[PDB]
């Protein structure tokens, strides 16, 4: 209840500081299954000197808007895409939804004009995508024609170029870096189909954005696709800094080709300083910006390989641990996500958690889930093989 | 820079950069910004900010104590607006909360639909022309049917067609707005609710800005004969109400608070991997501090300290509007909330002209008039600069 009398700061403080005493901390090891980790410690400096801008009212913080679009040239550049329009953004699901709006509204144009026989825009939509597509799908009344996916976790490119020759397809989303493994779908035949047919192509490397571009050959293997941005001609590349970019809640990525896709994403905001939004957020973070640019200019590719290249190494570790005790990791890996078999996956996570280790579970397969974030070290690893053999 | 290169940067090269950039953005403080309704935070939560960066309420099992935070700061919010059982989220801001409150509502009509019982082919919505622009994203992104209420002399919903067209359709939800976006103004709830509730019609109200004002108002305040009733007292379904406006609070923190816990059946979407396997939010990874400063700010002020902030916000309302008939400009009208509105065929100009002269003021959609939100850092020497730079400029 809200009392009449204010309570002293150093009293609130306190009291704050024991219910963060029940959190767990990325950097204590008891953390597996998060692609969130530790932020770098600049970025701390950065959310203070910009916790009080607005992007959400440009006008009024003309340096911080700069910066965003900045960060946005920044992970154009890292794209392939020097001409590259987007916004530092919520997150990934803000991402993924604004993806799925241009789509429909691509689609509604069509429609208007007699020009679409869907009722609904129809998107093709891979198995292993992420749950915002599924928000999406339930908020935009969208009619998704799912695709199944092969023996190495990735969208079967047979069916969708089957499908677009069946249907009127309005969008096809490839994955790059999936929520579940790692895997990278294959992007270069997606959007060769997508080109030939004239569809909208979106790329969710929410994930996998940050971590591929700066992948070490010693690290790539034979037949699996690493080909996934501009350079490919897709239409839009979700990408966020608060995952593999070690920069803080909310710190998310959109970026489409060019500033022409800004036609099918505005919505007036009459009292604002940008009267025209194309974020689905009004009032929203300008740190955001400010620490993916930062960030990236901080490390420079450089620091970036140094920190996935350890993650790698520490993710080869982890599956190397789980075969010489015999468990079946699903996949080698691609990424720095490791998933384990397990018959009774839901229960060990379970036995698992009330042991202090806290791993995910996947989706599609009957599977523990590991993301080998930059707090994970060897040492952690070794504590989890010994809690997982001692539950086994 | 704007291309990626191989090495970094040091650190004091990057903070340089940033404040360079920092220090063309104006600052709350320095009486510029007349027309927003975000001001400075209160400095105890640059300190919760802090603590709390590193959490995310998207995967709540892995943070338990924040989680916790974000449940008390919403059961302070839901005693606050008469309501000790609410269900709700420290959400993003104001646009996310009113878009779950579309959602649930949608989800109903399709639970109806399907059971055939709505002659609706998509939801029909009354919603006032007064309506945020939130509203908009959310009838182009979901396919809402919109009946677009219109409004009376004195800037509120017109019950009467609301009654009018709840008896000529099938309505699937009402928006009523307590602290209109453009002038402050207040529909009358309590009519709406009595109409929504005789007729089992959902009501949402969107308070994202009068919800951290009205509980405070001084009598001194209030006019006779305005509606002041706004909360679940009424029986409503959700309130939108945000943290980050009259709650002092750093972006993002917003609020939207439910009747009770079974709204959120309406709201689930299955999240396989993470600790809590349904989530309600639209967002999914999403910051821990808004609910802890949330939380920290209403306790640390109280209603002592609530009631001082905004009693000092109307001082200076009061103030602006007398200085405002005191130099013959004819303000919208007389402020209910610690909004001021000031009519002006010319209004699109001047107001490129005063931000020519460093004052930054908003504008009105249903009027033409130039619109002004007297926040805590608005005080009587910015108000009166303001006024001689508009006389300047007339
Ligand atoms: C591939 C992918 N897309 C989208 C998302 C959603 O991102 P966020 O949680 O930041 O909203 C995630 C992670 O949850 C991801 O794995
Ligand atoms: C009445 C009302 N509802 C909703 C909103 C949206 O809030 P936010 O910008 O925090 O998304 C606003 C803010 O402008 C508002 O004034």
């Known amino acids: 209840n809200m009392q009449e009398k204010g309570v002293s700061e150093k009293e609130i403080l306190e009291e704050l ?22 932020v770098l410690p600049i970025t701390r400096k950065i959310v203070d000197i910009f ?32 001409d590259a329009y987007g916004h530092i953004v919520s997150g990934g699901t803000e991402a993924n939804l604004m993806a799925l709006r241009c789509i429909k509204n691509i689609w509604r144009e069509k429609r208007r004009k007699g020009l679409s026989k869907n009722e609904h825009p129809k998107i093709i939509v891979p198995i292993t995508a992420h749950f915002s597509f599924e928000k999406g ?22 069916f969708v170029k089957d499908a677009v020759e069946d249907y009127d397809v309005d969008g096809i989303i490839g994955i790059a870096g999936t ?43 034979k037949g699996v696709n690493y080909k996934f941005d501009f350079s490919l001609g897709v239409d839009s590349i979700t990408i966020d800094p608060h995952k593999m970019g070690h920069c803080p809640i909310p710190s998310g990525g959109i970026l489409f080709k060019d500033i022409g896709y800004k036609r099918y994403l505005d919505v007036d905001a009459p009292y604002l300083t940008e009267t025209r939004q ?29 920190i996935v290249n ?82 086994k």
């Open 17 to 38: 500081k024991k219910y963060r005493s029940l959190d767990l901390k990325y950097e204590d090891g008891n953390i597996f299954g998060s692609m969130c980790s530790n």
């Open 51 to 82: 916790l009080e801008t607005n992007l959400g009212d440009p006008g009024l913080f003309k340096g911080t808007k700069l910066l965003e679009e900045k960060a946005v040239a920044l992970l154009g550049s890292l794209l392939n895409n020097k």
């Open 137 to 158: 799908r339930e908020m935009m009344d969208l009619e998704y024609i799912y695709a199944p996916i092969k023996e190495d976790y990735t969208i079967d490119e047979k």
């Open 179 to 221: 929520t579940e493994l790692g895997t990278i779908d294959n992007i270069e035949e997606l959007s060769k189909i997508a080109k030939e047919n004239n569809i909208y192509i979106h790329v969710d490397a929410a994930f996998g954005g940050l971590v591929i571009p700066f992948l070490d050959d010693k690290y790539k293997k």
């Open 278 to 306: 194309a974020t689905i957020l009004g009032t929203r973070v300008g740190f955001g910006g400010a620490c993916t640019y930062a960030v990236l200019r901080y490390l420079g590719r450089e620091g970036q390989r140094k």
């Open 310 to 391: 350890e993650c790698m190494e520490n993710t080869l570790y982890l599956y190397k641990k789980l075969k010489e005790n015999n468990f079946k990791p699903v996949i080698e890996p691609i990424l720095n996500i490791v998933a384990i078999e397990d018959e009774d996956y839901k229960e060990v996570c379970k036995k698992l958690r009330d042991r202090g280790i806290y791993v995910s579970v996947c989706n599609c397969v009957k599977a523990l889930r590991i993301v080998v974030m930059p707090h994970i070290k060897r040492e952690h690893i070794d504590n989890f093989i010994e809690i997982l053999n001692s539950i």
